């Protein structure tokens, strides 16, 4: 099937019509999304069957057909872009300066852009085009806008 490096929608037919449940990244023969999108299930790519390879509910990540390949980081200074892929709408770059999730284990990048839940797994990029993490796992603040992390995996 399709293995071209790039960005993809995650769809289901199990509900009314064709529903977009999230987004992921294809890089070096491996597909990357968030755990809450697929819950570890197998995916189809036309006549192809993508099997889960690695997943961790706490990180809220999962890779298909091989180990996690993305190992770029928000450098804490430079702006970024959410390559938002919203349900039934064209891919759109949005440029933002991320804020910070302070936790007991350390500090994480955060973006306060409210897209529908089916946008989960859209990639966040640095100025060289490198994927520094995925969108869709954070918190809703008083303001009603969701704040998502910059969720990034460890390459082995």
């Amino acid at each position: 099937g399709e293995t071209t490096d790039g960005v993809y929608r995650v769809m289901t037919r199990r509900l009314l019509g064709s529903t977009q449940v999230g987004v992921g990244v294809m890089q070096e023969g491996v597909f990357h999304t968030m755990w809450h999108v697929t819950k570890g299930a197998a995916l189809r790519s036309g006549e192809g069957r993508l099997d889960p390879y690695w997943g961790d509910v706490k990180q809220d990540l999962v890779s298909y057909c091989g180990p996690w390949k993305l190992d770029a980081a928000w450098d804490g200074l430079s702006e970024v872009q959410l390559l938002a892929v919203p349900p039934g709408e064209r891919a759109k770059n949005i440029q933002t300066l991320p804020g910070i999730f302070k936790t007991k284990d350390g500090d994480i990048g955060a973006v306060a852009l409210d897209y529908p839940a089916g946008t989960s797994g859209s990639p966040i990029l640095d100025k060289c085009g490198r994927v520094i993490g995925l969108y869709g796992n954070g918190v809703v603040i008083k303001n009603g806008s969701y704040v998502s992390a910059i969720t990034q995996g460890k390459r082995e």
Partner: protein
């Protein structure tokens, strides 16, 4: 039974729309992978 469809190339766009704020938030991460606001 979930399937994937290509949506684009992964590229930095010069003069993309620039937006969103940069909040510093105290959060906790539970074993279920849910973030919550501390205070």
């Amino acid at each position: 039974d979930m399937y994937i469809e290509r949506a684009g190339d992964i590229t930095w766009e010069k003069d993309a729309e620039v937006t969103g704020n940069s909040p510093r938030l105290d959060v906790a991460l539970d074993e279920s992978g849910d973030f919550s606001l501390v205070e």
